[PDB]
Design a protein around this ligand. Structure first.
Ligand code: C5P
Lengths: 130, 130
């Protein structure tokens, strides 16, 4: 099952990358751990002329630093930062701010201390506040 | 367009409602809003105010009516961001012998925070949810 799910895709991607002229293929953390093993085996067997490298990173480690001159509006929408949060400390961690700093900017959030469902309309309102 | 007698109250409001509605200018009625000129001091009163207040009105320096509107696209959390700390509001209104009357727009009564505070201060001497 997992072969039928991964190996045909990586074979296609390698052939297409060669066809487009890419010399180096970077596989990114977590997802690339298995995919790069597959790709290396394919390249060895087929003698394909292309290098592979592994790079570490995640949405967490890359989205925030990418705020060069503005905080993307995506940050305050459905696939943004304040999503899937199931507790007040989850809101804290999503805000990037320490607990005290968060309560200092937005004192109203103190009323959300003991809640345990910060999804739905409440999340949209919190996004509008931030 | 054929049977609606629309009640305008001023030239500005008449022009506004003509802009925003599909009414017949020749069916416009000009006068007062009945709800603004019927329940006067010696007007009509279907209930005694004192049966709804925690104390007789005389025992309050000021009767305050907080009557916000509904914000478009948000309901859950609006009231909390408008009145985050009901405890301190109660303290202040007590020290001042003020009766703070929460009369939110009907659409806003579904904010979970609204129900929470309405139950929390159902017997409050200085905060009254209408
Ligand atoms: N806090 C509020 C807001 C609106 N209302 C009622 O709704 C009417 C329309 O108000 P809106 O413009 O806010 O929808 C008001 O004239 C009043 O009769 C109320 O009774 N209490």
């Amino acid at each position: 099952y997992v072969g039928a799910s991964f190996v045909p895709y990586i074979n296609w991607a390698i052939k297409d990358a060669i066809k487009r002229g890419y010399e180096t293929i970077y596989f990114i953390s977590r997802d690339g751990h298995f995919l790069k093993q597959i790709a290396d085996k394919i390249i060895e067997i087929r003698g394909y002329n292309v290098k592979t490298k592994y790079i570490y990173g995640s949405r967490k480690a890359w989205r925030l630093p990418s705020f060069i001159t503005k905080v993307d509006d995506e940050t305050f929408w459905q696939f943004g930062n304040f999503v899937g949060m199931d507790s007040f400390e989850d809101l804290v961690k999503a805000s990037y701010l320490s607990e005290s700093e968060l309560l200092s900017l937005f004192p109203e959030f103190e009323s959300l201390r003991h809640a345990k469902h910060l999804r739905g309309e409440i999340a949209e309102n919190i996004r509008k506040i931030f | 367009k054929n049977n609606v007698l629309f009640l305008t109250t001023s030239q500005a409001m008449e022009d506004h409602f003509l802009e925003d509605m599909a009414i017949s200018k020749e069916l416009i009625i000009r006068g007062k809003y009945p709800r603004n000129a019927v329940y006067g001091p010696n007007g009509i009163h279907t209930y005694d105010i004192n049966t709804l207040l925690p104390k007789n009105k005389s025992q309050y320096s000021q009767t305050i009516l907080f009557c916000p509107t509904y914000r478009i696209g948000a309901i859950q959390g609006v009231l909390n961001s408008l009145l985050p700390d009901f405890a301190k509001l109660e303290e202040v209104c007590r020290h001042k012998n003020q009766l703070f009357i929460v009369k939110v727009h009907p659409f806003m009564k579904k904010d979970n925070y609204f129900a929470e505070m309405s139950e929390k201060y159902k017997d409050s001497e200085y905060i009254l949810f209408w």
